[model samples]
Target: DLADRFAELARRYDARLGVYVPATGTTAAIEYRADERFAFCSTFKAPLVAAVLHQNPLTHLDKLITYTSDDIRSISPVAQQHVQTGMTIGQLCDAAIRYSDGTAANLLLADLGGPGGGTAAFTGYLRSLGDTVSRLDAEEPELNRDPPGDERDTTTPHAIALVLQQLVLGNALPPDKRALLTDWMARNTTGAKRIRAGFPADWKVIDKTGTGDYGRANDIAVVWSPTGVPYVVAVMSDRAGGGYDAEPREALLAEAATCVAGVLALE
Candidate 1:
């Protein structure tokens, strides 16, 4: 029933849409093309940060890491702002999550072992979580290519949603680390136009957003819906030929989320 409604929405928007809502106390889980691969985009930041926090998170978070102009990218808002002050590892994770700062992500990727190590490392981390379908093929910007047929740097909605539920709400991560990560999630500044748009006025949403080629618009979130039970949602949208610089189907994501709300009777 929900799939048909979502398929209709996909047709209306001329884009492919994928959704995965893990079961909550009040709502059973549902899926719509959730197994289809969609470019992971910046949504990788969630797991990336999760990996960094998996063991001794505070140790890493407390250590300060400074950067030079070489590390800065055009969209690195937090990194550039803290040039002289030098940020802690914790703040770098914040930059990646809140602003989707390319430089900040690159730096953490490097710390996790980059050039190629970080990519493999994240993939390995995903595997450690028993996630075989999700992958991280490259650093930011390049990874956002999101071409129609390529599977590199892409994840099925099912894959990402499970990982998020495990890390954010399950026992996959340490308590304090989980607390810190969720705190950062709730403070994310980039989700207003996506899934959060469909949130009920009284609900609280913690999310991360991604915009990329092929009109990709993604938001993965943990929401306190209708009552107090929390739910996890991942919505990925894209137009096949929408090109490298196409307009993201932002409205479609909001609409998809509204559809999710309706399914749960939040409307």
Candidate 2:
């Protein structure tokens, strides 16, 4: 019955959906064309933060980083808030994960030793978790700028879900540092209406959301049920012409996640 309900929800939606629940096994517990790759979008922010914190000492977290004219050009709430003054490395990390700020991500990348260092750290960490398919080749603004069709960052739903799993239980970082990352995610407000929309009030969902140039909506989360067990879910949706409405797909992801909650409860 759980599988049947999940299948129906995926069928009714127009975008690809991927749900990876470790409690079920290695493969995705419920998926619809999830292996297909799409733009990484802002979902990359989570791993970016992880990689930075992984390589840097605790002192680096509070190191100050100033803003430039180019940094202010990004579309971000934190950037707007700090337009006059700059933010510390930790503050940028919070904005990057909690607010999904593009400028914050770029600053972190630069601080992490440019695209090469960031890419090396991020991809290396993913490989350690048994995921090697995803890659981060360019920084924001440039990555988002202009115009080759399909010329953007890429990752699969399966890969994204594994990243969330690693963040949740892989012990990638020590307890104290890991707590910081999870706490920032818990405070995320960008994805409030998407995956979290359909869950019951008691459930806790820590997540990062991504929005691209078009009608692309992406969210990967570590969902904790009332029973205390956790499920990792990653949902990605995209449509052509850039005019696609995200509401329907958002509901679809929530519905699918709810079905997962039922299945996990039964287990």
Candidate 3:
């Protein structure tokens, strides 16, 4: 298929690409790796979101999860801003997952027994599901600071690809949980032109994108094709530059990724 041809081209083209293409019924799949442990940035949210939904699959909303004054999620004042009418845990998770809201995510993370709750907890969950390469969400400890610290969450292309594989097979989470996660990914508020950049407009692509300045540039994502083909791709770099338009450097990586994914879609 073209994915093999294009993956070869990605290496020849100077940009690095890691891709996982999974068959319909099994968790094991194909992979191409450029490096291990790229800065997760906001991509950490994927596992974090999964952890929340796994724990609260019932769509619990009765007693909202609240954190202390210094709790990371609460610090943003998002709760004061959006939870006024009292949103359910499910609703808050939808915003956190779809919008990539740091506040919403951090709030939940804080409540999950602090950073480790979200990160470590998610990691433990993935391990139980037969995935080991992808590091937990909190490995990179720093939250969304403009100039992020070095202690940020990290995930390898290989590891994240496995996560996507499970997500596609209806094996990662329960049937209902997988549907909810996919639905949220499809509704992601991140700009559509990045990882989602490659597919045709009519295609039903569900994906997520993350970008942050970790003394450089970083972007990562998991994309699903219209035919229900699931592929995981994460491209992260320390080089940060922009054209006059400043369209977000992360999108540039996404564009490069789009070129790769666009080719795979044809396959």
Scored by lDDT, the top model is 1
Residue range 12-80, candidate 1, lDDT tens digits: 898889999988776788899999999988899988888888844487788888788877754787898
| lDDT, residue 257, model 3 | 64
lDDT of 2 at 79: 68
User: Which candidate, 1 or 3, would have the higher lDDT against the true structure?
Assistant: 1
TM-score of each: 0.94, 0.85, 0.72
Residues 1-267 of candidate 3: C-alpha lDDT, one tens digit per residue: 544654555454433344444433433344555444555666666666677667774645344765443443322334445544545567666766676666666656654554565666666766766766555444222443323224345566666656665664446678877787778877877747665665566456566666544333344445556666655555554332332122234444555565656556654
Q: Which regions in candidate 3 have their CA more than 4 angstroms from the true location?
A: 1-35, 57-62, 67-80, 83-86, 114-117, 136-152, 215-230, 240-248
lDDT of each: 0.86, 0.72, 0.55
What clash count does candidate 1 reach?
Answer: 1
**Model 3 per-residue lDDT at 25:** 48
Compute the lDDT of residue 200 as modeled in candidate 3. Answer: 61
> Candidate 2 or 3, higher TM-score?
2
Lowest lDDT block of 10, candidate 1: 53-62
lDDT of 1 at 3: 90
Each model's RMSD to truth, in Å?
A: 1.7, 3.2, 5.1
